[PDB]
Amino acid sequence: NSVRDAYIAKSHNCVYECARNEYCNDLCTKNGAKSGYCQWVGKYGNGCWCIELPDNVPIRVPGKCH
């Protein structure tokens, strides 16, 4: 469908660095997701992972963050 679990991105192909869960939940839900949390030690380091983020919101994909 139109939603996916994903790292929400900020320009240009960067995760939102994090430490605490509430920050990520706030960020993710503002952007239409159901919830979110801070994933420590993931594919791109520590970043906010959103649950059921709408597909029109950019996400982290393979490539260089800058």
* Structural domain that includes position 4: 1-66
Please give the method by which this entry was determined. Answer: X-ray
Q: Which CATH number does the domain housing residue 40 bear? A: 3.30.30.10
Measured between alpha carbons, how far is 15 from 45 in angstroms, rounded to an integer? 9
Q: Which residues contact 46 (CB under 8 A, 6 or more apart)?
A: 15, 17, 18, 19, 38, 39, 40
| Number of separate domains in the chain | 1
**Tokens 């239409």 found at:** 32
**Helix residue ranges, H only, 1-66:** 21-30
Distance of CA 47 to the CA centre of its chain: 7
